[PDB]
Design a protein around this ligand. Structure first.
Ligand SMILES: Cc1cc2nc3c(=O)[nH]c(=O)nc-3n(C[C@H](O)[C@H](O)[C@H](O)COP(=O)(O)O)c2cc1C
Ligand code: SF4
Ligand code: SF4
Ligand code: SF4
Ligand code: SF4
Ligand code: SF4
Ligand code: FES
Ligand code: FES
Lengths: 209, 455, 216, 121, 112, 80, 114, 78
């Protein structure tokens, strides 16, 4: 049955066991996100969706935190604003300066959430520069620019769970973790083009377009 | 006064391979003597004894062992049909620490017995002992002992005729520090890459193979049968309140004689050093710092260890921790900045890469520490580096990120003037530096950066 | 770094057939038996290891064989194999030198050990020897911090090292023999202070049975 | 650039985000001002606690008291403190920065005495 | 520094002033709004002549200069058009705004 | 406005720009409600069509569901 | 003054068809078409400026991330027919080639201030 | 903007005719010259646009080096 909690002072009633980001969406509160998507399994790897919960001592991932009766949630605290800036700072430090040549430009959630929740200027001026990534060929439909990848794993979750195409995955570890097929394989599925919509950034784009 | 451990009060008697690890030798030690009666006693009694013991987690976090074990027994647990699992964490991996390797090599039968007893206390159907892959010979020793225990009906269908079934298996890790994290450990057991899960769900609810599981350190499990035999009050008699019992204290670094030994909690650091390790190389005057516990904890300056007790409470009050009780001393001849840079490199290498704050922040921390090592940085950047650690701390899926943030913070707090001196040395020596380590002659040429050192 | 792309060579190529030897097979059956029947994909890490024992390294052919044997998609096995550093995805030599360079080893001369090894074998820490006999590696903590400057040879630890001692160790390696299974020139029995035991100086250990809880 | 805006180590953007700390436009219809007259204000209350205050707020928020009955009921103290000034006078149309004019005459003037153009400072 | 802060006391003054006006012409003033230094009165069209007369001729207001009149189209409202008047008092160095509404067929009283 | 076939867009023969004869082609009105929009359209004598919006159906999502124990053969390997 | 499209010292065009100039243009004077070049580069296939719509505000030159579209100091390009004032890409590239040296003086003097 | 920081006088007529207005404009010439001189003497150092890149575009050397600056520039111009 539905339980009841409060978000930013408002009262919201939601089915028991639903994720906190679902209750936030129901109560009309906007929460930034990258890896969460309504049609994919919850991942919780981007860390953009942090909120404060009075029982929780540190901010929690909204997308993966189950709601409980009497929960009190604040999406607007100074700690939450600080965390959003911190996460965006870490996300942009290796992201390539590609917006003029990137097809995502102008309809990009990274651009928009940088504008809405991030710092106005960066602090990263390291002389060893940024990480670069090899590009990967997965057929004539989906062009890849993998410097842009922010490792949200939406493409992998869609390709595995929804389309049933397990050739896609993440190889390596740490800074060198790469989305791909680990060897030259097409992303072979009649549903493949959907990953272009799912990729929040210009990492996977429409090649004919 | 705290710390005099007497040999009769010693738990891990084969620590120096003075009595053997054969099952007969462990029998001489008394292992497997009352195991029938310990099983026959109610799980409630084992849990309540472990609670009365004061034992707390030995993998580095020091949660109450009894309560953590109790969580696998909710009121209606039996109604959830299926296997229940005990997982034993022997991933070591924390640089500085060697205790579990000694426990696996010298007293394996004690570990096997601890798995049986804990599994009873948790109503577990089977155990899995997760072992780091570089401990190949340790794995061979532990297997051999487990085969012995299987042979003698100590571990199997009717564990000493208990009517309680237990199976014990070894699973080997293959080179990942993060797999010491309990949820990463479970994911690696299941046949995936060792990326940790978010909590909730907690392992007691949903764990290994989606079943109720509990992940525990090998020293908290290995001491358990001795604890049960000798009584909770006795184990409580050693160490102060809430830090009670006796821990292994591996000591490494710049001491005259490195060692591995067991001692009462709440022992002074000065006394521990002087009496076990022959003391700091050069004398207490020649001590820069000590890291109490492995690389993940903030380093102690010279004048706090003169008064500090090897507990959780005392170390936390001075803003560090016990961790795995892996002491590392650094004398005045070594560079603390180089050591912290090496720790930053370790954390950059051991990040699983799942979550952005860790996956990117560890790399940024390594770049900054490479520049601070040579002095190619501006002084205000120290403050920026401090703020950088706060980007990672408290924002990550698992606690590797907090571990990566902490040593830097200890370094800044305790040795800022060291870094300022190195910066002066660079500025006089090489030239004037901009933020990020740029200098007036540095620019991009035909694919590279030229005009600058490039740390 | 970590190499996370495979490129087909003639020696590392999917077409190359890899089958387990019968003894390795029977072992693989036994290893699979330890996990629930539905969750036998949880044997991928041991099975891959067995493959890397039979053949020199974890090749793509081995990855695909293990993937077929556990009915997994090969990308799941690729993820596992590239995640864990103890899987060697490039072929190596007979002797794998692994120098721990983490801070406890560094504070005690791991840099000197590295210089000795690099001088004897000109190769860099990632490179393998021209005669395909030695392969170096810098590594993180191996769990032997008491044994201050330690090292690994293919499976075995060698501790309390010295530059000249390491030259002699590499020489004995290169001739074919093995000087000592023991970790070092016998200065200690693997964990005690160099001045000898300060505790546990009793000829026989105290049985725990003289202390019992009065409630058994 | 200016300090502290250019600092690399102590300025979160949200502490100087003045666009997002913009003042809300305050709208007052006659029901709200009725409530201000009857119940007093957050600054100086004239409300009872418990259910009494919430029910008073509700019944003004529903239409029970009109603005004109509100004004007639209002006492001398309310009318003088909170509608007029403490002296009973109306408030004057307010000015943000009052300007005191002065007339410059003599040699410092722009034109001499004859011209029909004076100098105001 | 937040630029809005310098207005705070003035904002209070405007509130007080608006209260007086609404208490003096409760037949006419539907409402008022206050943003930093701008005070708006909201009235029905039939209220325009009296209120304007008041604003022009009362001793505490004295809004002698008409600055502008315009309309704003709000197609969602039943009355499309809001008519906006801005007035200046050189006597008191003060500005004020007055709003009413209209449609494509219902006129407003001219203030010529 | 719906497009008119003849007047919508054609290629200019001089420079290649897109010409148009439909003066409404770029106009879009915004309304705060469907009812306000219908009222305005009726008041202007405009023939209209209402396209009712579609919304995402709600379902319960749980992170823990990624790890539920399987009693029989796994239907797929979840990877994360 | 009159617009030009610039090159890199190699001779490659600087414009990569981001279309920021087209978006910012207050007079909607710029019309752009692009696709992938046979070598894989992102490049324009059409770049038009209606000089009789342009207001010579310089916003395109401010917006460009690669200094591709610029205004020269040239004012002496009056024409006898209006058709001559619809600049296509060839005309603009030729203007860049023609005026590059004066453009370099202007950039060397004002680049630090942008 | 800075009119509170400079010193100038205001000319006022009395006849409300074209000649008074001419005299006013001629005096305003002089007062503007006064203010221009004060600005030439008191021009301070620092930025000339608001230092928030969500409002005004960042400088070009940041735009071509820093990721946040490039994003903000792209968004402000599109
Ligand atoms: C990066 C990381 C590595 C860890 N490695 C180990 C380990 O090697 N051995 C261990 O016992 N606990 C390790 N832990 C902590 C355990 O996951 C867990 O918190 C607990 O300490 C184990 O059970 P315990 O209460 O008996 O100590 C690690 C934690 C983190 C965040
Ligand atoms: S993905 Fe977004 S932020 Fe990254 S280059 Fe493309 S448009 Fe810019
Ligand atoms: S390619 Fe796109 S969808 Fe896939 S992980 Fe990277 S950012 Fe996410
Ligand atoms: S904190 Fe680091 S190790 Fe832990 S889950 Fe995140 S990326 Fe992986
Ligand atoms: S100068 Fe201004 S009007 Fe002319 S093309 Fe450039 S942006 Fe458009
Ligand atoms: S001229 Fe510059 S701004 Fe215009 S499309 Fe080309 S690169 Fe983009
Ligand atoms: S959306 Fe919640 S962590 Fe990514
Ligand atoms: S640092 Fe070398 S084994 Fe621990």
């Amino acid at each position: 049955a539905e339980i009841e909690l409060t978000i930013d002072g408002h009262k919201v009633s939601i089915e028991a066991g639903s994720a906190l980001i679902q209750a936030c969406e129901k109560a009309g509160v906007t929460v930034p996100r990258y890896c969460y998507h309504d049609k994919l399994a919850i991942a919780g790897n981007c860390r953009m969706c942090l909120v404060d919960v009075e029982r929780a001592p540190k901010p929690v991932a909204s997308c993966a935190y189950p709601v409980a009766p009497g929960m009190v949630v604040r999406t607007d605290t100074e700690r939450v604003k600080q965390a959003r800036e911190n996460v965006m700072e870490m996300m942009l430090q290796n992201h390539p300066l590609d917006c003029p040549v990137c097809d995502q430009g102008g309809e990009c959630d990274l651009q928009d959430q940088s504008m809405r929740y991030g710092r106005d200027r960066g602090r990263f001026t390291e002389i060893t520069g940024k990480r670069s990534t090899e590009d990967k060929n997965i057929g004539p439909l989906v062009k890849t620019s993998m410097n842009r990848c922010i490792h949200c794993t939406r493409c992998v979750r869609f390709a595995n769970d929804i389309a049933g195409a397990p050739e896609l995955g993440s190889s390596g570890r740490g800074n060198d973790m790469q989305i791909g097929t680990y060897l030259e394989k097409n992303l072979n599925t009649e549903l493949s083009g959907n990953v272009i919509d799912l990729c929040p950034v210009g990492a996977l784009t429409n090649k004919p377009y | 006064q705290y710390g005099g451990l007497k040999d009769q009060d010693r738990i891990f008697q084969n620590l120096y391979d003075n009595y053997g690890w054969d099952l007969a030798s462990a029998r001489k030690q008394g292992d497997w003597y009352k195991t029938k009666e310990l099983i026959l006693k109610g799980d409630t009694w084992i849990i309540d004894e472990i609670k009365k013991s004061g034992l707390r987690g030995r993998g580095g976090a020091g949660f109450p062992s009894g309560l953590k074990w109790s969580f696998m027994n909710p009121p209606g647990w039996e109604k959830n049909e299926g296997p229940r699992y005990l997982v034993v964490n022997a991933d070591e991996g924390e640089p500085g620490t060697c205790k579990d390797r000694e426990i696996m090599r010298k007293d394996p039968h004690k570990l096997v017995e601890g798995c049986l007893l804990a599994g009873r206390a948790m109503n577990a159907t089977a155990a899995y002992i997760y072992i780091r892959g570089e401990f190949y010979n340790e794995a061979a020793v532990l297997q051999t002992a487990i085969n012995e225990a299987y042979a003698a009906g100590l571990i199997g269908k009717d564990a000493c005729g208990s009517g309680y079934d237990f199976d014990v298996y070894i699973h080997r890790g293959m080179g990942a520090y993060v797999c010491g994290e309990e949820t990463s450990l479970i994911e690696s057991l299941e046949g995936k890459a060792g990326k940790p899960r978010l909590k909730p769900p907690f392992p007691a609810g949903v764990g290994l193979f989606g079943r109720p599981s509990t992940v525990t350190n090998v020293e908290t499990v290995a001491v358990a049968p001795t604890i049960l035999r000798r009584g909770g009050d006795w184990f409580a008699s050693f160490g102060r309140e809430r830090n009670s019992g006796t821990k292994l204290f591996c000591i490494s670094g710049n001491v005259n004689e490195p060692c591995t030994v067991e001692e009462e909690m709440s022992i002074p650091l000065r006394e521990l050093l002087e009496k076990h390790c022959g003391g700091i190389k050069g004398g207490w005057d020649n001590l820069l710092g000590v890291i109490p516990g492995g690389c993940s904890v903030p380093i102690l300056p010279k004048n706090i260890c003169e008064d500090v007790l090897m507990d959780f409470d005392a170390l936390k009050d001075v803003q560090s921790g016990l961790g795995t009780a892996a002491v590392i001393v650094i004398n005045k001849q070594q560079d603390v900045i180089r050591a912290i840079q090496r720790f930053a490199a370790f954390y950059k290498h051991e990040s699983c890469g799942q979550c952005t704050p860790c996956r990117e922040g560890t790399t940024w921390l390594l770049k900054a520490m490479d520049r601070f090592r040579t002095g190619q940085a501006k002084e205000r950047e120290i403050d920026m580096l401090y703020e950088l650690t706060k980007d990672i701390e408290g924002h990550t899926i698992c606690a590797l990120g907090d571990a990566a943030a902490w040593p830097i913070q200890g370094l800044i707090r305790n040795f800022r003037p060291e870094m300022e001196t190195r910066m002066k040395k660079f500025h006089d020596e090489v030239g004037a530096v901009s933020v990020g380590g740029w200098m007036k002659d540095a620019r991009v040429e035909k694919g590279k950066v030229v005009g600058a050192p490039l740390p | 770094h970590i190499v996370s792309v495979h490129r087909n060579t003639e020696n590392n190529n999917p077409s190359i057939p890899f089958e387990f030897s019968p003894e390795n097979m029977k072992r693989a059956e036994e290893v699979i038996a330890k996990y629930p029947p539905q969750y036998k994909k949880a044997a991928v890490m041991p099975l891959l290891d067995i493959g890397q024992r039979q053949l020199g390294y974890t090749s793509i052919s081995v990855m695909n064989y293990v993937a077929k044997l556990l009915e997994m998609p090969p990308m799941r096995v690729y993820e596992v194999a590239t995640f864990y550093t103890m899987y060697n995805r490039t072929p190596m030599g007979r002797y794998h030198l692994q120098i721990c360079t983490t801070t406890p080893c560094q504070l005690c001369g791991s840099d000197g050990i590295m210089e000795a090894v690099q001088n004897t074998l000109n190769i860099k820490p990632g490179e393998t020897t021209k005669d395909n006999l030695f392969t170096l590696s810098e590594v993180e903590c191996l769990g032997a911090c008491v044994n201050a400057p330690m090292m690994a040879i293919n499976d075995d630890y060698y501790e309390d090292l010295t530059p000249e001692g390491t030259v002699k160790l590499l020489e004995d390696c290169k001739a074919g023999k093995m000087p000592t299974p023991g970790p070092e020139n016998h200065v200690r029995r693997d964990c005690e202070p160099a001045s000898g035991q300060k505790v546990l100086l009793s000829k026989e250990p105290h049985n725990v049975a003289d202390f019992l809880q009065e409630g058994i | 650039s200016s300090y502290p805006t250019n600092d690399i180590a102590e300025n979160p953007y949200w502490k100087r985000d003045h666009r997002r700390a913009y003042p809300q436009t305050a709208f007052f219809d006659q029901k709200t001002v009725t409530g201000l007259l009857e119940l007093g204000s957050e600054a100086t209350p004239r409300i009872a606690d418990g259910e009494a205050g919430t029910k008073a707020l509700a019944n003004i928020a529903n239409g029970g008291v009109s603005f004109t009955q509100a004004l007639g009921k209002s006492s001398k103290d309310v009318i003088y403190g909170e509608v007029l000034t403490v002296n009973g006078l109306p408030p004057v149309a307010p000015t943000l920065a009052p300007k005191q004019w002065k007339i410059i005459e003599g040699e410092a003037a722009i034109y001499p005495k004859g011209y029909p153009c004076r100098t105001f400072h | 520094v937040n630029p809005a802060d310098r207005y705070l006391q003035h904002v209070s003054d405007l509130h007080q002033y608006a209260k007086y006006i609404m208490a003096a012409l409760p037949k006419y003033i539907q409402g008022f709004s206050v943003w930093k230094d701008e005070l708006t009165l909201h009235v029905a069209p039939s209220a325009v002549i009296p209120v304007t007369t008041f604003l022009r001729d009362n001793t505490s207001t004295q809004y002698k200069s008409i600055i502008d009149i315009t309309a704003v189209d709000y197609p969602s409202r039943e009355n499309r058009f809001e008519v906006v008047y801005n007035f200046l008092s050189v006597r008191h160095n003060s500005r004020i705004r007055l709003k009413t509404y209209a449609t494509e067929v219902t006129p407003v009283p001219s203030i010529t | 406005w719906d497009i008119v076939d003849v007047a919508n867009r054609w290629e200019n023969d001089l420079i290649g720009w897109q010409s148009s004869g439909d003066y409404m082609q770029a106009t879009q009105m915004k309304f705060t409600s469907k009812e306000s929009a219908i009222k305005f359209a009726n008041k202007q004598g405009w023939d209209f069509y209402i396209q009712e919006p579609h919304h995402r159906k709600f379902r319960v999502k749980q992170y823990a569901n990624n790890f539920v124990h399987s009693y029989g053969k796994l239907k797929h390997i979840r990877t994360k | 003054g009159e617009h030009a499209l610039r090159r890199y010292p190699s001779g490659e065009e600087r414009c990569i068809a981001c279309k920021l100039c087209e978006a910012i243009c207050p007079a909607l004077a710029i019309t752009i078409d692009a696709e992938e070049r046979i070598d894989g580069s992102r490049r324009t296939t059409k770049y038009d400026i209606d000089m009789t719509k342009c207001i010579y505000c310089g916003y395109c030159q401010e917006s460009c991330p690669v200094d591709a579209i610029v205004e020269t100091p040239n004012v002496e390009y009056a024409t006898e027919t209006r058709e001559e004032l619809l600049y296509n890409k060839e005309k603009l590239l030729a203007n860049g080639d023609k005026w590059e040296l004066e453009l370099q003086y202007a950039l060397d003097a004002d680049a630090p201030y942008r | 903007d800075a009119y509170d920081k400079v010193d100038f006088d205001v000319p006022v007529g009395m006849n409300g005719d074209c000649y008074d207005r001419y005299l006013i404009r001629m005096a305003e010439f002089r007062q503007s010259l006064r203010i221009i001189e004060q600005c030439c003497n008191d021009m301070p150092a620092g930025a000339v646009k608001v230092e928030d890149f969500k409002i005004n575009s960042p400088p070009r050397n940041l735009m071509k080096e820093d990721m946040e600056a490039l994003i903000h520039h792209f968004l402000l111009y599109t």
